[PDB]
Amino acid sequence: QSEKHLEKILNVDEFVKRIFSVIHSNDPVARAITLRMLGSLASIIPERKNAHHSIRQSLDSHDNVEVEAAVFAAANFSAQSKDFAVG
Amino acid sequence: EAVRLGPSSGLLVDWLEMLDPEVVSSCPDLQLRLLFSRPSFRPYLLTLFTHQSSWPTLHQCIRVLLGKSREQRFDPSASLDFLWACIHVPRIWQGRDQRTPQKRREELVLRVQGPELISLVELILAEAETRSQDGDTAACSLIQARLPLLLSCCCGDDESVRKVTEHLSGCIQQWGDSVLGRRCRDLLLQLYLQRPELRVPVPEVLLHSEGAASSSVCKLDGLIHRFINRGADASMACRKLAVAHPLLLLRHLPMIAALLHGRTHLNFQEFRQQNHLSCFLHVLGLLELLQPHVFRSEHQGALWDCLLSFIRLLLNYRKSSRHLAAFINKFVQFIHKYITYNAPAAISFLQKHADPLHDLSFDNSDLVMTA
Amino acid sequence: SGACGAFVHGLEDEMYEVRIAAVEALCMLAQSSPSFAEKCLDFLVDMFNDEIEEVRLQSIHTMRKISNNITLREDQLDTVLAVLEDSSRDIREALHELLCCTNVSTKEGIHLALVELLKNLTKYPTDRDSIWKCLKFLGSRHPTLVLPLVPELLSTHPFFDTAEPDMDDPAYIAVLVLIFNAAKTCPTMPALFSDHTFRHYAYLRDSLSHLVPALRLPGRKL
Amino acid sequence: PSMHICLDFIPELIAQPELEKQIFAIQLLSHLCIQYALPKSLSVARLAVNVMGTLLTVLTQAKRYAFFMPTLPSLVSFCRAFPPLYEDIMSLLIQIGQVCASDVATQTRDIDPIITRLQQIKEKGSMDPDVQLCHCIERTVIEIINMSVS
């Protein structure tokens, strides 16, 4: 919802770390929510290689909602981040 | 199937998915001919039949397609990826952990019968003989790509034995030597397949499962030779694997020739315990146990000449012929290699012309000139 | 007829303005004549402990200009230690270009160079591109010398398969790209790989192509 | 994928006065070791081998049979997953075998599996429980040998 108030964040590294620290769990719904959150943040972190690797790994996962969340995050990170597009 | 409707064809495809829920519902022969024939909407209809047909109908289609029939009523180009999609249906793997199998042996497999697998391998080897513009390396790449499903559909030693014992005849577009040599991926220990591969003498870079054990044994032997209980399999298992499976040793010879390169550093050859007499004698015995492999085809000179130069450097840097049995064994091996083939001498003369000016004694002039 | 020296007595005699000309004549005579290198490489290596910022770079240059038909078994420690004594910001790239174009006799020198490059990385992460390029060149020069060292570089276990290293670690990506570059002409490279090595190669190859080459792994396609 | 956490209560499931709970714990640990390979899994497998070896001398024949009939494939999978345990398992097996060697000779039988020592395995009904346990031990040893050799 609050997308325009996203670029005015001072501490970005700690925020991204706290967001990404929950994608390593074994819960597919949690991983899907984390992927959707990362895709929602595709306007402030278009070069974080960890997010690209997570989206690449979880794109062909054995699930149904996690795959859709990975597709959404991949579209968001492919809008920007030419490197993610070519990858 | 008859009219060449260019733009409207897709419209007809709609009528194939609107008033026809199951593909094989009214007539099986016409649908099988439309799906698998001797066009453009083929992959879409294949995906529809894969993700919209019931399991009994799918098994029936699989058993009627992969059956023994020489009427060419099924395209193997579509049959291969159809089977690959039926094995990897996303409904079969719903929510389990992603990519955590056992690489030693796959448990979840698709069981098949005898004649079914026979017809499958027959059509696979038959369609891989066209080679319109692929060449030769692309055929091997396709074989390597389709080998996983071929090993997954059998999952048994009896099926592998039945597969390796079937060798067709002919001399044009054989393409069987590659499949017979691909047994190294399944860690096959059959002597018939090894004999067939040795008779074919086909050099292949296929990824083998038993190559890791051979590499580990070679590394352990090298470490034991460089350090001096680990010496048990260092000299007894290596030669056993060499006399049993010579292809693995021939393919591992690249990394073996790069070892024992400590002769240039220590030129004394009198103070070394085993780093200059054990590994050299071991590799000399390994080469002696492979007389039929030293005079083999090409793609092995890069290792043969390397081993020859290493032996020459070890003999020249010796403490004035500190070893008697090793020199005699090396001379006998060189004589046998020169008598078995003429390319070995033509390739080693460039080093012999310089090695004959170092000793200049009655020992190097042996081959340079009971019961 | 020659009854003089000026080769082993002209180096440690006076100021370095003549040492530079001496090593220049040395590399000039070694470039033309293919011989004479095996007996002058020792002298060219042992002249590094000269505590002069000029003779060091000139030694790097004369070794790079003669990096052909030469061997290196134990003379590497006297030529690699030029990066620990000081910063040498403008000499480090030359040393890395030298270490990649040369040949190594055994795997011990390869392991020494690798651990030294890892030390330089963990101590100076500001020149990782030069390290990756030199490792690429080293892997493309002689890929066989690293074959008996594959299970020793990366931490792997025959029956555990645990202790997964960090992805963005600048210490493991170097070894990964070195293995991938040495995996070109190796007969059976993936026979000793781990489980995550295949996905690491799949991610690095699709992200960058100037350092990771194309392979024929059974897991990948095309 | 959330089955590894069961390891954290596998030892607690072993220390139970019911033989069925112990058998189920041994089988679950066997499957977890053949699926997951971790040092903690190796430690729990070693503890299971120890508690199975110490239960051979505190159980009667009627309970020994029922406890060692299902739990031998567990040892087979432990050998398949953990090489360094081989010796231990072998020793354990030997012990159990010798125990059976004293149980068959006690009471007269109908098949006399003692003279069957000089027999080979043939690829691939109602009998005596001790003879059945002997045959199960022999079969599991054969499978362990075939897995380790191939």
Swiss-Prot record, chain A:
Entry's localization field: Nucleus; Chromosome; Cytoplasm
Assembly and oligomerization: Component of the Integrator complex, composed of core subunits INTS1, INTS2, INTS3, INTS4, INTS5, INTS6, INTS7, INTS8, INTS9/RC74, INTS10, INTS11/CPSF3L, INTS12, INTS13, INTS14 and INTS15. The core complex associates with protein phosphatase 2A subunits PPP2CA and PPP2R1A, to form the Integrator-PP2A (INTAC) complex. Interacts with NABP2.
Function: Component of the integrator complex, a multiprotein complex that terminates RNA polymerase II (Pol II) transcription in the promoter-proximal region of genes.
Family membership: Belongs to the Integrator subunit 7 family.
Protein name: Integrator complex subunit 7
Species this protein is from: Homo sapiens
Gene name for this UniProt entry: INTS7
Curated annotation (Swiss-Prot), chain B:
Top-level taxonomic group: Eukaryota
Compartments where located: Nucleus; Nucleus membrane
Subunit field text: Component of the Integrator complex, composed of core subunits INTS1, INTS2, INTS3, INTS4, INTS5, INTS6, INTS7, INTS8, INTS9/RC74, INTS10, INTS11/CPSF3L, INTS12, INTS13, INTS14 and INTS15. The core complex associates with protein phosphatase 2A subunits PPP2CA and PPP2R1A, to form the Integrator-PP2A (INTAC) complex. Interacts with ESRRB, ESRRB is not a core component of the Integrator complex and this association is a bridge for the interaction with the multiprotein complex Integrator; attracts the transcriptional machinery.
Job of this protein: Component of the integrator complex, a multiprotein complex that terminates RNA polymerase II (Pol II) transcription in the promoter-proximal region of genes.
Similarity remark: Belongs to the Integrator subunit 1 family.
Disease: Neurodevelopmental disorder with cataracts, poor growth, and dysmorphic facies: An autosomal recessive neurodevelopmental disorder characterized by severe global developmental delay with motor impairment, cognitive delays, absent or severely limited speech, dysmorphic features, hypotonia and cataracts.
Protein name as it appears in the record: Integrator complex subunit 1
Organism: Homo sapiens
Gene designation per UniProt: INTS1
Parent-protein residues present: 1607 to 2044 of 2190
From Swiss-Prot, chain C:
HEAT repeat ranges, renumbered to this chain: 1-33, 34-72, 74-112
Subcellular location: Nucleus; Cytoplasm
Signal sequence interval, chain numbering: none
Record's function text: Component of the integrator complex, a multiprotein complex that terminates RNA polymerase II (Pol II) transcription in the promoter-proximal region of genes.
Assembly and interaction partners: Component of the Integrator complex, composed of core subunits INTS1, INTS2, INTS3, INTS4, INTS5, INTS6, INTS7, INTS8, INTS9/RC74, INTS10, INTS11/CPSF3L, INTS12, INTS13, INTS14 and INTS15. The core complex associates with protein phosphatase 2A subunits PPP2CA and PPP2R1A, to form the Integrator-PP2A (INTAC) complex. INTS4 is part of the RNA endonuclease subcomplex, composed of INTS4, INTS9, INTS11 and inositol hexakisphosphate (InsP6). Interacts with BRAT1; interaction is required for the assembly of the RNA endonuclease subcomplex.
Similarity comment: Belongs to the Integrator subunit 4 family.
Name this protein carries in UniProt: Integrator complex subunit 4
Organism: Homo sapiens (Human)
From Swiss-Prot, chain D:
Localization of this protein: Nucleus; Nucleus membrane; Cytoplasm
Entry function: Component of the integrator complex, a multiprotein complex that terminates RNA polymerase II (Pol II) transcription in the promoter-proximal region of genes.
Subunit structure as annotated in this protein's UniProt entry: Component of the Integrator complex, composed of core subunits INTS1, INTS2, INTS3, INTS4, INTS5, INTS6, INTS7, INTS8, INTS9/RC74, INTS10, INTS11/CPSF3L, INTS12, INTS13, INTS14 and INTS15. The core complex associates with protein phosphatase 2A subunits PPP2CA and PPP2R1A, to form the Integrator-PP2A (INTAC) complex.
Family of the protein in this entry: Belongs to the Integrator subunit 2 family.
Name the UniProt record assigns to this protein: Integrator complex subunit 2
Taxonomic source organism: Homo sapiens
Included stretch of the parent chain: 1033 to 1202 of 1204
